[PDB]
């Protein structure tokens, strides 16, 4: 039985767990995607802002 | 030239935060550790992995 | 000299307008961070990218 119990704890904590380094990578991707994201958004705000020259 | 919209501007807001909900639920499931939290990621992985926990209790 | 027609600046507002066009077709695939986000650009290379997506998968 204590053998069962551990083969079958193994394979349900790997079936749910999730594996921490592929997370950290992803969330190091992502975060890094949204930071550009946002200095381009900040950039493209003062596009529309050239044509003002000649009000 | 248009100037009453920018268009360019609302979509590079709307890939932000599409990509803004993805790293939201990337940190709730780092958070607890699980790629399973709430229903919608695998109800079928979500399913074995209680009677799995039924099974080991 | 004829002023009821300004043909240098007609030259300036289409050189930029078409100018403003490709500065916003840069600006969205900076946005979307990628190199083809809308069609025609290249399909091929869209529907390698999909072909691709669907086999990583």
Known sequence: LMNAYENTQASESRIRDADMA??????TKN???VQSGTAMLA?????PQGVLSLL | ????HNLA????HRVLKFQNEEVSKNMEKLSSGM???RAGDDASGLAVSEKMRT???
């Open chain 2, 35 to 37: 790629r399973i939290n």
């Open chain 1, 31 to 33: 975060q890094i995607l």
């Open chain 1, 43 to 47: 950039q493209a705000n003062v596009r």
């Open chain 2, 1 to 4: 030239m248009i100037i009453n």
């Open chain 1, 22 to 27: 592929e997370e950290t990578v992803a969330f």
């Open chain 2, 55 to 57: 099974q080991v209790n």
């Open chain 2, 9 to 12: 501007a609302i979509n590079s």
